[PDB]
Amino acid sequence: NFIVLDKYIKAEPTGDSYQSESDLERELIQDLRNQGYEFISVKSQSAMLANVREQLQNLNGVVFNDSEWRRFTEQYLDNPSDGILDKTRKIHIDYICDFIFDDERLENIYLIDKKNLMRNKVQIIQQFENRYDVTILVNGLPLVQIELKKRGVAIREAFNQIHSENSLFKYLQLFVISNGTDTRYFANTTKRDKNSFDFTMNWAKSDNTLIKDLKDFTATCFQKHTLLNVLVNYSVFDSSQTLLVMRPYQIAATERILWKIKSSFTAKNWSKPESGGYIWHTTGSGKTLTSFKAARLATELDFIDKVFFVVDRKDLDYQTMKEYQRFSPDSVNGSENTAGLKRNLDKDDNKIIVTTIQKLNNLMKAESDLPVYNQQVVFIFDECHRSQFGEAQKNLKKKFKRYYQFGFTGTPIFPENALGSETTASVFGRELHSYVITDAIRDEKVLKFKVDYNDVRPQFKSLETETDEKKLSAAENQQAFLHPMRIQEITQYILNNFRQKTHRTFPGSKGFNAMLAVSSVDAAKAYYATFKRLQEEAANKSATYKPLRIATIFSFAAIGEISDETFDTSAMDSSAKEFLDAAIREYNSHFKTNFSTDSNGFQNYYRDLAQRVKNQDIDLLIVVGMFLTGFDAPTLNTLFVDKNLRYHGLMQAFSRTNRIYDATKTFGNIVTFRDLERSTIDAITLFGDKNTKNVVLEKSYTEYMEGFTDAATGEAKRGFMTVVSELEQRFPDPTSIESEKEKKDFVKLFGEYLRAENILQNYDEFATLKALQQIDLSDPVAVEKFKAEHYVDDEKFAELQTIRLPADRKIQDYRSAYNDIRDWQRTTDWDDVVFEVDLLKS
Ligand SMILES: Nc1ncnc2c1ncn2[C@@H]1O[C@H](COP(=O)(O)OP(=O)(O)OP(=O)(O)O)[C@@H](O)[C@H]1O
Numbered sequence: 081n082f083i084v085l086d087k088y089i090k091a092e093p094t095g096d097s098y099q100s101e102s103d104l105e106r107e108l109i110q111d112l113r114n115q116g117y118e119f120i121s122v123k124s125q126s127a128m129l130a131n132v133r134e135q136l137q138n139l140n141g142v143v144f145n146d147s148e149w150r151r152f153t154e155q156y157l158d159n160p161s162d163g164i165l166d167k168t169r170k171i172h173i174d175y176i177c178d179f180i181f182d183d184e185r186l187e188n189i190y191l192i193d194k195k196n197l198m199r200n201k202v203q204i205i206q207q208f209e210n211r212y213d214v215t216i217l218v219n220g221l222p223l224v225q226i227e228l229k230k231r232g233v234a235i236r237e238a239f240n241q242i243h244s245e246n247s248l249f250k251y252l253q254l255f256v257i258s259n260g261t262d263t264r265y266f267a268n269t270t271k272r273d274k275n276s277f278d279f280t281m282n283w284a285k286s287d288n289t290l291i292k293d294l295k296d297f298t299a300t301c302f303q304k305h306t307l308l309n310v311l312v313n314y315s316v317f318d319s320s321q322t323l324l325v326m327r328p329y330q331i332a333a334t335e336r337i338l339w340k341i342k343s344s345f346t347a348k349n350w351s352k353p354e355s356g357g358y359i360w361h362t363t364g365s366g367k368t369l370t371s372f373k374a375a376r377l378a379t380e381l382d383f384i385d386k387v388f389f390v391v392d393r394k395d396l397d398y399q400t401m402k403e404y405q406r407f408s409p410d411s412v413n414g415s416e417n418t419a420g421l422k423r424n425l426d427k428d429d430n431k432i433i434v435t436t437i438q439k440l441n442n443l444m445k446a447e448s449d450l451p452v453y454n455q456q457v458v459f460i461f462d463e464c465h466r467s468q469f470g471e472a473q474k475n476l477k478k479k480f481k482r483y484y485q486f487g488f489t490g491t492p493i494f495p496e497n498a499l500g501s502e503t504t505a506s507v508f509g510r511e512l513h514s515y516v517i518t519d520a521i522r523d524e525k526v527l528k529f530k531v532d533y534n535d536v537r538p539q540f541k542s543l544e545t546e547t548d549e550k551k552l553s554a555a556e557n558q559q560a561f562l563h564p565m566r567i568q569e570i571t572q573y574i575l576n577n578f579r580q581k582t583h584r585t586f587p588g589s590k591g592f593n594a595m596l597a598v599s600s601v602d603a604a605k606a607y608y609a610t611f612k613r614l615q616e617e618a619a620n621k622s623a624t625y626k627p628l629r630i631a632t633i634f635s636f637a638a639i640g641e642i643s644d645e646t647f648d649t650s651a652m653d654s655s656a657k658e659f660l661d662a663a664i665r666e667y668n669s670h671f672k673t674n675f676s677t678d679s680n681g682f683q684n685y686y687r688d689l690a691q692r693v694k695n696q697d698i699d700l701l702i703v704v705g706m707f708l709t710g711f712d713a714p715t716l717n718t719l720f721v722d723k724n725l726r727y728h729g730l731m732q733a734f735s736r737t738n739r740i741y742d743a744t745k746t747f748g749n750i751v752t753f754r755d756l757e758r759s760t761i762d763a764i765t766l767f768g769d770k771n772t773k774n775v776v777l778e779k780s781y782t783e784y785m786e787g788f789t790d791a792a793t794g795e796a797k798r799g800f801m802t803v804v805s806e807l808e809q810r811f812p813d814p815t816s817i818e819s820e821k822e823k824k825d826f827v828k829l830f831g832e833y834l835r836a837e838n839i840l841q842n843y844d845e846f847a848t849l850k851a852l853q854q855i856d857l858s859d860p861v862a863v864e865k866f867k868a869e870h871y872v873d874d875e876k877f878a879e880l881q882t883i884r885l886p887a888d889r890k891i892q893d894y895r896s897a898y899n900d901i902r903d904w905q906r907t908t909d910w911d912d913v914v915f916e917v918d919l920l921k922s
């Protein structure tokens with residue numbers, strides 16, 4: 081009984097009228113009752129408490145006297161000092177209160193029955209109390225809130241508007257908001273960087289087709305058996321205490337894995353490709369969240385003995401290690417050591433084993449008579465890199481007698497890119513579920529890429545477009561790719577443009593950070609050193625120079641594939657080692673840390689580093705092959721690439737930037753100093769088809785300036801220039817304004833102006849054009865200063881020199897105006913107007 085359906089016919093409208101919020105509520109409520117939600121009238125917390133008493137007493141087969149119930153309420157149910165996070169902890173972890181009654185007996189009081197999900201009572205109430213809302217109670221507790229909006233209303237603006245007491249509502253797990261035509265859900269979390277519209281979600285079928293309109297959503301997501309599985313089994317509450325509600329493709333993959341295990345086991349058809357299967361979830365879509373989740377759920381199968389969750393040590397980071405520490409303590413790190421693996425194996429009242437592919441491979445190599453070999457075993461592999469994985473297969477196939485193995489990847493191995501390895505199909509069998517890039521991009525769950533070769537160094541162009549790889553390896557030296565001029569010019573470009581690319585320009589904007597991925601240890605050395613030196617140079621010249629905080633990490637290697645780097649620092653050549661040494665020292669001074677380069681220190685440096693790049697304590701991380709495949713940083717938006725990336729490694733590295741965040745993060749910038757255009761298209765095309773590139777890759781500067789049609793959608797989009805010109809035709813102020821309808825129009829228009837500028841901020845052509853608005857002239861030392869920093873012709877100079885932009889002041893007159901009109905919310909009709917909330921606040 082899958083909860084993400086293969087098939088669903090659309091409900092028919094009544095109708096039976098359906099404009100008004102109270103129209104939507106009437107039907108929602110009616111529909112929910114048909115589906116077996118008892119409707120109750122509740123007017124007060126007091127009435128809710130009593131209802132909870134009735135429900136929990138029923139659930140738990142026990143009656144409180146009033147003094148106990150008061151005590152239960154004050155100490156567990158509804159502590160005055162609990163907040164949302166505490167209730168979520170209670171729903172997800174501490175849902176049993178071991179209660180001691182007046183007569184001194186001890187009894188487990190469950191808020192939810194998780195084993196017998198359908199035993200839970202579900203009920204609905206309406207808003208008690210100017211806002212229509214329906215709440216679903218589970219055993220009396222409010223866990224879902226549906227916010228209802230007029231058909232007119234732009235869901236996003238409504239979301240923008242809303243997102244103790246009365247204190248029971250601290251239990252909400254899930255929000256749904258709907259204007260009838262559209263319906264999105266999102267988790268109730270206090271974590272503000274999970275709180276933007278980007279994290280709201282549509283319900284869907286297993287082919288990922290959306291289910292948008294409320295009646296269909298009701299009849300699907302809101303089946304008791306669906307809703308309660310979502311709440312209880314398909315929401316994650318992790319170690320940073322973030323509630324994440326799984327998206328449909330995540331649940332669809334997960335349930336399909338579990339059912340596959342069960343039917344295999346029942347068929348006694350273990351230990352072949354047809355016993356398991358694979359999951360093609362595109363890079364960044366939550367493979368690691370989902371696969372881990374599915375391993376945890378798999379432990380609940382009584383007949384499975386042990387569940388291995390296996391990750392690649394390459395993919396580890398701080399959040400992720402924190403998370404595994406709870407299930408397999410000090411056993412999931414970068415080392416070859418198995419001692420910890422083999423100790424977790426011998427724990428009992430235990431079924432989950434998390435480990436790396438390196439470790440599992442070592443263990444099975446060494447190791448011949450493990451009881452686990454004869455047990456009923458599940459393997460879930462999260463994106464394991466292709467070669468470590470291959471030796472592991474040989475032994476696992478050799479050695480486990482009864483297993484069901486599954487893999488998640490965003491970049492499968494097909495016959496075409498096989499060479500070396502077994503295809504993914506051949507290893508795992510059937511594709512159980514797919515959610516591919518064009519899917520994720522249509523759903524706005526992954527960001528597009530803006531990819532440009534920074535072709536601005538003629539001296540070195542011929543190197544930078546070289547295709548033969550023998551030559552490319554031959555050129556990794558100071559004569560060629562690490563010529564100190566090349567390194568300088570590139571590094572200068574990066575210092576000149578970091579703030580522009582990461583949107584730290586018109587600050588106090590927070591903005592983003594960045595990585596620089598390079599071809600070799602030496603490259604990283606040259607770049608680190610050059611950054612250091614070039615920042616000393618600014619620091620004297622200027623002196624309100626605000627330095628970027630740069631760091632680097634690497635060790636030792638040794639297509640498609642990003643080279644695996646060891647965590648055994650003693651493999652490195654003496655000079656590499658000493659440089660890493662001096663960098664760690666500098667890092668130690670700055671952050672008051674105390675790492676070293678012995679293996680334990682390096683591992684800890686690695687771990688602190690991930691944390692600090694995630695939280696932007698570091699501005700630029702320089703890297704050879706590390707943090708390129710698994711590292712999760714939503715506020716990283718720019719990859720600088722001086723590296724020969726191809727195929728799956730290309731897709732992975734670029735994807736470091738692809739995490740959604742908010743309206744401020746429009747796509748990931750990829751700025752390359754070798755020409756990666758062919759490679760980029762070949763890679764995208766390998767993992768889609770011939771059209772896939774037009775969905776993944778952003779449009780040209782000229783297209784955002786002058787207008788185009790999104791072939792995906794086909795939305796015609798203006799035209800920053802069209803926009804700017806409309807603003808001036810329509811709207812030079814303040815008399816331009818001042819009828820309400822004109823205000824509406826301005827808001828819509830200046831909305832687009834804001835979206836367009838924000839997009840354009842990521843184009844060198846634009847940053848260049850903007851800079852030219854100073855200067856002048858003379859000038860004309862600072863004429864020359866500017867030509868040289870934006871790499872601009874005389875020729876080009878004269879061009880740019882009027883394209884015409886609106887004055888800064890004229891803009892801040894629009895701005896505050898704009899803001900003005902927003903604050904006086906709360907003819908003419910205002911339903912469909914979205915304000916650029918995120919972009920403003922920036
Ligand atoms: N259902 C969800 N709800 C909220 N946030 C999510 C959800 N799924 C993923 N995310 C967030 O998206 C980001 C990517 O998740 P994750 O790292 O598991 O993706 P991935 O596919 O493993 O990426 P990679 O391919 O780089 O390993 C994380 O910050 C994660 O918390």
Ligand SMILES: [Mg+2]
Pocket residue numbers: 367368395463709710
């Ligand atoms: Mg991952």
